Design a protein around this ligand. Structure first.
Ligand SMILES: *[C@@H]1O[C@H](CO)[C@@H](O[C@@H]2O[C@H](CO)[C@@H](O[C@@H]3O[C@H](CO[C@H]4O[C@H](CO)[C@@H](O)[C@H](O)[C@@H]4O[C@@H]4O[C@H](CO)[C@@H](O)[C@H](O)[C@H]4NC(C)=O)[C@@H](O)[C@H](O[C@@H]4O[C@H](CO)[C@@H](O)[C@H](O)[C@@H]4O)[C@@H]3O)[C@H](O)[C@H]2NC(C)=O)[C@H](O)[C@H]1NC(C)=O
Ligand SMILES: *[C@@H]1O[C@H](CO)[C@@H](O[C@@H]2O[C@H](CO)[C@@H](O[C@@H]3O[C@H](CO[C@H]4O[C@H](CO)[C@@H](O)[C@H](O)[C@@H]4O[C@@H]4O[C@H](CO)[C@@H](O)[C@H](O)[C@H]4NC(C)=O)[C@@H](O)[C@H](O[C@H]4O[C@H](CO)[C@@H](O)[C@H](O)[C@@H]4O)[C@@H]3O)[C@H](O)[C@H]2NC(C)=O)[C@H](O)[C@H]1NC(C)=O
Ligand SMILES: *[C@@H]1O[C@H](CO)[C@@H](O[C@@H]2O[C@H](CO)[C@@H](O[C@H]3O[C@H](CO[C@H]4O[C@H](CO)[C@@H](O)[C@H](O)[C@@H]4O[C@@H]4O[C@H](CO)[C@@H](O)[C@H](O)[C@H]4NC(C)=O)[C@@H](O)[C@H](O[C@@H]4O[C@H](CO)[C@@H](O)[C@H](O)[C@@H]4O)[C@@H]3O)[C@H](O)[C@H]2NC(C)=O)[C@H](O)[C@H]1NC(C)=O
Ligand SMILES: [Ca+2]
Ligand SMILES: [Ca+2]
Ligand SMILES: [Ca+2]
Ligand SMILES: [Ca+2]
Lengths: 197, 197, 197, 197
């Protein structure tokens, strides 16, 4: 396989609500088997995408149904805020990154061309701080249609009115697959850097 | 108008790998603050559930998440193997007693209409002994989607490969809430007279 | 606040490795302040407990920690081997008399319903002689989780590898409080009729 | 297996509430069989860790469960307050050193990059004295998620209400494995210095 892993969630044991510097360097780790929760690190991700790449997102719900989304993908440098560039969607999970959510349209929930934010480095399009409330570092707009770095709620369906400190859909979510009130069981991001050509 | 406690786990201080006699009579104790581990006794459950009842199950993981399930409940007599009869699920934990584990399939993992089995009194649907392997007395099929009388593994996530003497998923489990290789921190079962609600 | 003392250990001055006759009659003495080593006598225990009683057990280790356990207690007649009947545990020492050792299981280490055995009158559940080897008269099963009449080792922790003639865990022990290889510094047993307090 | 032992507890007989000077030189003793309670000494720890090392933590609770944690580890010099630097968690006990306590908050209970403190030498991040209250010398933040040098409470489960002088969770603890209110039975820390390749 020419793919390499850049992110994975599988049991909620790792905290994803971290600082700019943790997202920049990478945290967590994977094993021999390739099991474990982690984030590769925005600085190495910038470097790995220099010559272009294909991103593959794999999702799994609490009943074992699966879906995937593939995109052409680039991550900008730290001066560009690690901005996201994606195009050419293909898959079964639905295009949450370019089109955002059907309920509230692209304008506010599209992720394409957004910078990365964290709770201590806000570069989103909201008057408030998305990352603080949604719980992870991500490419926020105002604020999201998808967030694989959100809070791990076990079981699937969750009632946001039951969350604290914020009564919001801050779970591990991909709207066009299971909706904003459904937190996913296992998720991973993998890229194929187009190193030759 | 209130509930009666019929089982509780919270620290693994009590061994639940017990005989048919221990499960018929009851073992364990609660202190006046309601703490401790126990099993009320199948003879007593048959008695209290004779006109029908509502069962409530309350589950807690090692990160503070909680969920519950409610059913209409009745246990059969001794000569009927204290067989379980449940219906009318409602809740947040997911229905592991009637639909069982969608992934493994209801034919093998549903608990409804199953007799109770212990290691010295096997009436499950497996050619082998479920209670022996899974570690406690329960309403086994072949073998389980849930088991609140399983082995208390401290800390939550466990790897069956490390278990001895059987390398299997025999923790305190409720598959539709936390999966099969996560053992819960605190669990309790409570009932109420059908009339009194 | 009147309890009658029935047993006490505190300085190892008294031999507890004695015959059926001596355990039936009683041996040892107390001073004016309630100090000294002693065993009241099983014939008196049957008599005083005929209508039920509350038993209180007090334990003290060599670092100053203390724990207690309370039970409803009865002893049978001589022809019944002065068998132990206990229920309704309450306390902080853990229930070593009814539930036994969490690790070894209730089947072999439970003391409830056992006969009292001495080296000259073995009625335990072992093919060998528990009382010979564990050093005192007790309500042995196969053989124990608790024994307040075992060997008084100095200082707490001991190594059975170092014991003669039997390399075994035969100290003054209460497994759920301090384990099997820690012998306790002071212990006592006391009773009172249910009515009072 | 090129491991050195650097700490070990097994029955609570050695007092761990000591001075900066005792922690710097080392205290306690081990017999030939590698048995005994002791602390190697921060000055010698700094020397053995100059080229990096692997730290192995081994834990045992009062019902026979065991867990371990491995980290890359280094301890700074005395001028740097013997600061802790760990990375690369793997294991089964959960990462209490880098993630801190999920419930109380990582910010306050994470141990990475903290300095060593003792009751007579406070460099913790609290306005009060962590070492004085929690009972031992340790790499305190405000104050802890783990502390193998805490007060030894017999039996496992303890009630903070019953502690004195202070009513807190100051037992021998590793929160992601057994929680803050359960004191462990046997614990050890061992290193493998990377003398290298
Ligand atoms: C680990 O090991 C360390 C080091 O040994 C321990 O740290 C010490 O813990 C002590 C426990 O909290 C801590 O507190 C001291 O308490 C003293 C009080 O003791 C009695 O007497 C004083 C006054 O006498 C009183 O205030 C206390 O309440 C208590 O009882 C009082 O006693 C007086 C005596 O007549 C009575 O009049 C009062 O009525 C009575 N009151 C009550 C409510 O009972 C303090 O005196 C002591 O202060 C010290 O003494 C002077 C006070 O200014 C000063 O010269 C000293 O520098 C210092 O202030 C203190 O408050 C000790 O201070 C801790 N010592 C150190 C070096 O840190 C840990 O407890 C151990 N950890 C664990 C987990 O076990
Ligand atoms: C609580 O009190 C109980 C009652 O006192 C104690 O129980 C008693 O426990 C002892 C120890 O096991 C038993 O001892 C009996 O006496 C002899 C003990 O064995 C020694 O002696 C024989 C032969 O003499 C020998 O083969 C053994 O090897 C051993 O020592 C040997 O001694 C010889 C010299 O004789 C020497 O040359 C050898 O080198 C040496 N061996 C070694 C390795 O050094 C046995 O002979 C006894 O066997 C039977 O014989 C007698 C009856 O005819 C009688 O002694 C025994 O009852 C037995 O039938 C036996 O070993 C006692 O049997 C036992 N008594 C009872 C009533 O149970 C108990 O120990 C104590 N508990 C605690 C914790 O302190
Ligand atoms: C991902 O992690 C981040 C990094 O940790 C977490 O973000 C952090 O989130 C906290 C919590 O929301 C931010 O602090 C907030 O709380 C304080 C106080 O909270 C409580 O008190 C205040 C009033 O004191 C209330 O506004 C809150 O609702 C809470 O309830 C109150 O509690 C009081 C006790 O303090 C009590 O007396 C009062 O009655 C009670 N009221 C109610 C209704 O319960 C807020 O004060 C704080 O606002 C701050 O104001 C300061 C100046 O006033 C500023 O300096 C602070 O920066 C901030 O503006 C804020 O609402 C914390 O700021 C934030 N940290 C960062 C770096 O962003 C994040 O939550 C995690 N997300 C998930 C999903 O986990
Ligand atoms: Ca903003
Ligand atoms: Ca079978
Ligand atoms: Ca026998
Ligand atoms: Ca301080």
């Amino acid at each position: 396989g020419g793919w390499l892993l850049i992110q994975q969630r599988m049991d909620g044991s790792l905290n994803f609500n971290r600082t700019w510097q943790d997202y920049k360097r990478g945290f967590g780790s994977l094993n021999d088997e390739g099991e474990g929760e982690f984030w590769l690190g925005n600085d190495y991700l910038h470097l790995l995408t220099q010559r272009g790449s294909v991103l593959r997102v794999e999702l799994e719900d609490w009943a074992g149904n699966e879906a995937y989304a593939e995109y052409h993908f680039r991550v900008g440098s730290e001066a560009e805020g690690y901005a996201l560039q994606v195009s050419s969607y293909e898959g079964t999970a639905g295009d949450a990154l370019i089109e955002g959510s059907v309920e509230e349209g692209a304008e506010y929930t599209s992720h394409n061309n957004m910078q990365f934010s964290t709770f201590d480095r806000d570069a989103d399009q909201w008057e408030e701080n998305c990352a603080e409330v949604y719980g992870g570092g991500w490419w926020y707009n105002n604020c999201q249609a998808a967030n694989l770095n959100g809070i791990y709620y076990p079981g699937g369906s969750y009632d946001p009115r039951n969350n604290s400190p914020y009564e919001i859909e801050n779970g591990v979510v991909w709207v066009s697959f299971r909706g904003a009130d459904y937190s996913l069981r296992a998720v991973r991001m993998k890229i194929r850097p187009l190193v030759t050509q």
